[PDB]
Design a protein around this ligand. Structure first.
Ligand SMILES: O=C(NCCC#Cc1cc(Nc2nccc(-c3ccn([C@H](CO)c4ccc(Cl)c(F)c4)c(=O)c3)n2)ccn1)O[C@H]1CC/C=C\CCC1
Length: 348
């Protein structure tokens, strides 16, 4: 009859439904292809995931699957299908099938000037998807240009929920210079000072960085390492006010900030001389040092910059809060949960 398709030293075990594969890219524990879906006659995106030797990979794969199967939103990537072996024993990989998107905002920003109208529309869609995510009590926790997918008509969809958590503001506090996983350039200042990233304001900061990057095609805070990231942030925002310092009770974090020379705020209109002044007013509100004072997603949608699109009746929320969380479980039980969670896509 036939054999399974190969790409770049990887079996792609997706047939017969999905054929005519082309390479896209590859992460640490997976690969990505486009493929022609024979049932719904359209090309799709397929990602091969091979997580079963590491619990962190298992944890992330499971998070993504559970979240994306529960969510249904125009600005959030869906899962169309999941392909895997019929038994746990035979299952070494999982294939996640999604709507094929032409590009991502990372690729687009390296090659394309965005008009103010494109920036406005991209930002609207990001916040619209984020409203839904936050309404489910979920934090994405790794919002960045490469996790914002775009199609040929500039519809935008948020992807990659492998680092997402249920929100937990009462346990957000930690010590100074506590290690963190999410992508450095989009990390809020409090991550390096006193926060575990368990509050919704962490995602708003990332969206602010994305907005700034859409305005200039360059990351606004390109730190080269953990504490350099804070150098870059303070370089533009200036020294925190007494009031903002008084919210950091942790002495190591407090005293670090106190040790720094006075830095003046760089006006947004000097960094972004061609930007819409309403865009800069909203940027300012998203990139506020004090997370308690940072604008929330629903306020950001209601901001004058987005007035041509704002329509809360057409900005849906999740039918219920998300729940259940997995941090202890070993890779063996996590394989059973991934097997269990993907079962609806099987024949039979
Ligand atoms: O149009 C073209 N080529 C375009 C090339 C291109 C692209 C492209 C697609 C994309 N699509 C797409 N769609 C759906 C989902 C995803 C997607 C992407 C990434 N992740 C995440 C990371 O974010 C992730 C997580 C874990 C692993 Cl382990 C991992 F690996 C990746 C997801 O979770 C989901 N990504 C994205 C980027 N880039 O060729 C024509 C025209 C040319 C002329 C003539 C010949 C004809 C051919």
């Amino acid at each position: 009859g036939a054999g399974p398709e190969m790409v770049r030293g990887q079996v792609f075990d997706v047939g017969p439904r999905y054929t005519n594969l082309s390479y896209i890219g590859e992460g640490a524990y997976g690969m990505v292809c486009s493929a022609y879906d024979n049932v719904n006659k359209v090309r799709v995106a397929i990602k091969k995931i091979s997580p079963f030797e590491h619990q962190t990979y298992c944890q992330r794969t499971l998070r993504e699957i559970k979240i994306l199967l529960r969510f249904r939103h125009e600005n959030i990537i869906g899962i169309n299908d999941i392909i895997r072996a019929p038994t746990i024993e035979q299952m070494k990989d999982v294939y996640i099938v999604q709507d094929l998107m032409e590009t991502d905002l990372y690729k687009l920003l390296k090659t394309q000037h965005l008009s103010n109208d494109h920036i406005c529309y991209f930002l609207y869609q990001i916040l619209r998807g984020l409203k839904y995510i936050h309404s489910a009590n979920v934090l994405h926790r790794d919002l960045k240009p490469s996790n914002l997918l775009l199609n040929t008509t500039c519809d935008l969809k948020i992807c990659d929920f492998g680092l997402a958590r249920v929100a937990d503001p009462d346990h957000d506090h930690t010590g100074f210079l506590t290690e963190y996983v999410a992508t450095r350039w989009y990390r809020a200042p409090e991550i390096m000072l006193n926060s575990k990233g368990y509050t919704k304001s962490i995602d708003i900061w990332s969206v602010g960085c994305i907005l700034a990057e859409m305005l200039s095609n360059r990351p606004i805070f390109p730190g080269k390492h953990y504490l350099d990231q804070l150098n870059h942030i303070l370089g533009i925002l200036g020294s925190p006010s007494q009031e903002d310092l008084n919210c950091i009770i942790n002495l190591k974090a407090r005293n670090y900030l106190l040790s720094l020379p006075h830095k003046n705020k760089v006006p947004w209109n000097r960094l972004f001389p061609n930007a819409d002044s309403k865009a800069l007013d909203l940027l300012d509100k998203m990139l506020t040092f004090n997370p308690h004072k940072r604008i929330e997603v629903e306020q950001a949608l209601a901001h004058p910059y987005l007035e041509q699109y704002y329509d809360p009746s057409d900005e849906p929320i999740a039918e219920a809060p998300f729940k259940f969380e997995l941090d202890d479980l070993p890779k063996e039980k996590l394989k059973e949960l991934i097997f269990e969670e993907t079962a609806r896509f099987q024949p039979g």
